[PDB]
Amino acid sequence: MDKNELVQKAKLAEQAERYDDMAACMKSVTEQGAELSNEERNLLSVAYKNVVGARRSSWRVVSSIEQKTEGAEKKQQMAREYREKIETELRDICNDVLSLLEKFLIPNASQAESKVFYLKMKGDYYRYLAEVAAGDDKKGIVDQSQQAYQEAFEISKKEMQPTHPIRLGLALNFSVFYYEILNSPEKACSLAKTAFDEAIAELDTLSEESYKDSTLIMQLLRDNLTLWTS
């Protein structure tokens, strides 16, 4: 349809909390080949985050039930089967997001801000695959997540101020990747503390239109620090 017709209907789907509709509209906007505005970029991000987030939460619930029914043969087999069904849904969602990133989003990203955004998204959705993967296929998945995070991290530190919310949010998810996926509580703590300290050291670079976004991510960086320091 018309791109603006697809965008505002995705904004309606967001208010109605129909994120399957919201992701479908923003996917067609991406499939039209044109670069996304920062508004369309966030609508696509919010939509698929809710779509994949529902499966991650359901996966955690069914996975935990699977381990607490260890000595319940019939109940554990059903929990194992249901976890495998949610996993297949979760892998299809990420594979679509990663497909959109490699064909339209990252290749057509003209700006450093958008490239950092899409490379962080590539690392995020490979991290979501790593949460449900195992073996050598997981090792290749994990390395893809680290490569996307690292390239986005190097571009963000060369092109963005330490108080930039996209750079701060990238350091937040990168540190989460180190703690939860690579089980390095301090390659994450150092990264998170460095991002927090460098943002406080240059608080003069923070903009009025983005300072409540950046201050919030600085609070989250410090929460992960406090929690990982425990």
Binding site: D124, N173, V176, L220
Partner: peptide
């Protein structure tokens, strides 16, 4: 408390 929210 974790990763980046919306």
């Amino acid at each position: 408390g974790g990763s980046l929210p919306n």
